[PDB]
Amino acid sequence: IRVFAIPPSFASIFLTKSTKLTCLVTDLTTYDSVTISWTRQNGEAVKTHTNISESHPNATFSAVGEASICEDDWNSGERFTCTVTHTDLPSPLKQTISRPKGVALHRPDVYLLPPAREQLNLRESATITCLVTGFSPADVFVQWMQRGQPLSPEKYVTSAPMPEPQAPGRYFAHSILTVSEEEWNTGETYTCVVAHEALPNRVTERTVDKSTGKPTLYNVSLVMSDT
Amino acid sequence: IRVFAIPPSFASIFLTKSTKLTCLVTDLTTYDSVTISWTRQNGEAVKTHTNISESHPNATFSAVGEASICEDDWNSGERFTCTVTHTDLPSPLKQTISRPKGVALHRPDVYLLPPAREQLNLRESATITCLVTGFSPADVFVQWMQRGQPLSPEKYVTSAPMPEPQAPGRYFAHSILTVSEEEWNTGETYTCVVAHEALPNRVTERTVDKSTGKPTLYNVSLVMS
Amino acid sequence: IRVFAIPPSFASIFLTKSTKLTCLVTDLTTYDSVTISWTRQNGEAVKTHTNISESHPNATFSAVGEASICEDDWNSGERFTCTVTHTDLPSPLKQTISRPKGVALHRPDVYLLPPAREQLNLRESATITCLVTGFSPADVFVQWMQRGQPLSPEKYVTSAPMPEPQAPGRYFAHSILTVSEEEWNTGETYTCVVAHEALPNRVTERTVDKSTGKPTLYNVSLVM
Amino acid sequence: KDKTKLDELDEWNDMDLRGTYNKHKGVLIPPRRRQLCFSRIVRGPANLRSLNEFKEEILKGAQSEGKFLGNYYKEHKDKEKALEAMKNSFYDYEDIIKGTDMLTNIEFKDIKIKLDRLLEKETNNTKKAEDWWKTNKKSIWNAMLCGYKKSGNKIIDPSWCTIPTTET
Secondary structure (H helix, E strand, O other): OOEEEEOOOHHHHHHHOOOOEEEEEOOOOOOOOEEEEEEOOOOOOOOOOOOOOOOOOOOOOOEEEEEOOOHHHHHOOOOEEEEEEEOOOOOOEOOEEOOOOOOOOEOOEEEEEOOOOOOOOOOOOEEEEEEEEEEEOOOOEEEEEEOOEEOOHHHEEEOOOEEOOOOOOOEEEEEEEEEOHHHHOOOOOOEEEEEOOOOOOOOEEEOOOOOOOOOOOOOOOOOOOOO | OEEEEEOOOHHHHHHHOOOEEEEEEEEEOOOOOOEEEEEEOOOOOOOOOOOOOOEEOOOEEEEEEEEEOOHHHHHHOOOEEEEEEOOOOOOOEEEEEOOOOOOOOEOOEEEEEOOOOOOOOOOOOEEEEEEEEEEEOOOOEEEEEEOOEEOOHHHEEEOOOEEOOOOOOOEEEEEEEEEOHHHHOOOOOOEEEEEOOOOOOOOEEEOOOOOOOOOOOEOOOOOOO | OEEEEEOOOHHHHHHHOOOEEEEEEEOOOOOOOOEEEEEOOOOOOOOOOOOOOOOOOOOOOEEEEEEEOOHHHHHOOOOEEEEEEOOOOOOOEOOOEOOOOOOOOEOOEEEEEOOOHHHHHHOOEEEEEEEEEEEEOOOOEEEEEEOOEEOOHHHEEEOOOEOOOOOOOOEEEEEEEEEEHHHHHHOOOOEEEEEOOOOOOOOEEEOOOOOOOOOOOEOOOOOO | OOOOOOOOOOOOOOHHHOOOOOOOOOOOOOHHHHOOOOOOOOOOOOOOOOOOOOHHHHHHHHHOOOOOOOOHHHHOOOHHHHHHHHHHHHHHHHHHHHOOOOOOOOOOOHHHHHHHHHHOOOOOOOOHHHHHHHHHHHHHHHHHHHHHHOOOOOOOOHHHHOOOOOOO
């Protein structure tokens, strides 16, 4: 008997603004009359759980328990118990959920790199990389904002938060986007946006364009003569 | 007897993320132990607000009621009733307040103006202007960020939205920050951040620098002879 | 029974080259024959207050008393009394009003800022900002001038005086104007004019065109 | 600037626009949508001064050397095969102006609508379908004009020089 108690992830918290936590029990017979309720640290009642799993053919009753917990309630540090009760087994099973407090929140830094000009000679494509590093804890959320409209995730990939051995147990990641050069040389900011808890407003922005790596001046000298 | 059920301002809502609605019932006759609380339109009571203001020095009594609600609950669109009961009130008063949903939305545009070049000649200071325009509706919130740490509110001045006449109902505003030039011509990104509902993520920011221009030069030195 | 006494303003004085002043009586019964007049400290008689406002539909009377005195007397700081007497107000209400004598003066300083670069690159319209700062007292006037022709007032927006926290008694104000992108690409005059009492001639102006802040790009040198 | 990439071949796919479950299901993509000539598509220029006096300029490079690309239908000897290529592309421009294309193109964005409503700011002759059809007679006529800039294989036959733009 395994009970998945998924809390609202910070990425989902920011994306939805309507944080929901799920609680479902597996390894059970496909039998009806299943109660999946939630209680606070003081055992206060919760809003009703809807969309319970049916008698699924997978030989398990994955009765999901959805609760519309407020953001302030979850971030207050209180732990909540998923009370699961079944007709066949009258004993409810206790699962307490809360944030893993501890390490302080360090503000990350995000650096955006223009494509290499030695790439921009073959006239085929270009690459944009925004790399975030130096943050605790993990689970940051990044995406792209272009010319005022968001982009679907399938045109770029991201990296899972890996620890950096040089520093203490901090984390880093990087987002990579591939865009052809013909449009790249005509404006096309392709701004990169990052969201993490430690930020004062939990949103930070980075931008690049043509006018990011232009040379400063020239010292051309011509001494045409026959001396 | 003046009753005001102040709706939570969007700027404070974003700043605190802990929206708190207030009810001010003043000009009442001097009478202690009043019955002040906040409820829903259906009567969902709130926590008993503490630190009640004493009787006003103007021969009246002050009644302050502050209540904490979830941001999504306030954004749902219900009505909040401040329940006030005083000796001079023959019946309890239910001050009903709700936000006016149904307004138009328009994303703003943000610009930053570097200080005038001849302003940077008398050696006192310089001014930087963050201009926001075209947003709808009003009540935008702006501030200044420096290397990740915000600056004192005393160091910048923010105007208030006004309806521009060049087009239908829209607004604009400008914030002015004064900075000594002797370290301005060194770096000091001095970024400006704005927040409004119409934004895709409710947050936007831009930045400038001493070297935010000055295109490529040429030093041709032809010496053909 | 409200009695306002509107003092002359610097902008009105500049536009009219006069010193019109008025006394308004509102929130009274819809009854005529209101004893409204203007007097000096010596109680001199002013000309007739023509165009008495008709009783408003909101059951509030409106009486206007207009007076015309030379500019020096208003600038002299002498208080002028609006004599108001009514059946509802048997006591003669006094409205002794004068300019705020005893205020320091500072020279305003003016700047013009060209429109933002990327806004021009976006190619819809351009915005010109005329900034004025470091002046005392308040009540300054602004206007826009284009190749010798004045512009309609609604095409530009002026701000209000605001005390900055750094300077104790100084102020600052803004002016915003918008034009089409291509017409500013032509970029002919677009000058901004400001009027304030501290100026030697009470008038100053600045100009800016399409190519003003553009720096040189070729430091070409030749030698034989 | 480039006139063409690799010609007709089995490379049409669906993952270029992934999650194509937007209207019915996933669909391949023709080369014509992949490679097509335009000049002002970024919001950089955004709007224009007076009108769209330069689409005809763009399509001048579409077949003068873009479809020429090395006389590929001259060695192939199938001039009518070239004719259908412009026929398909010309019908593509019909859908681009009318907001009918299904791709998530830059031109698919408001830039098509944003310009046309600006010129119709007072809603004078909101027939953006008809005025494009009105422009079609001259739009097609200049379409073969650049075809003559290509190697002089000009045939004055009405089938290859006058398409019934009224029907589609």
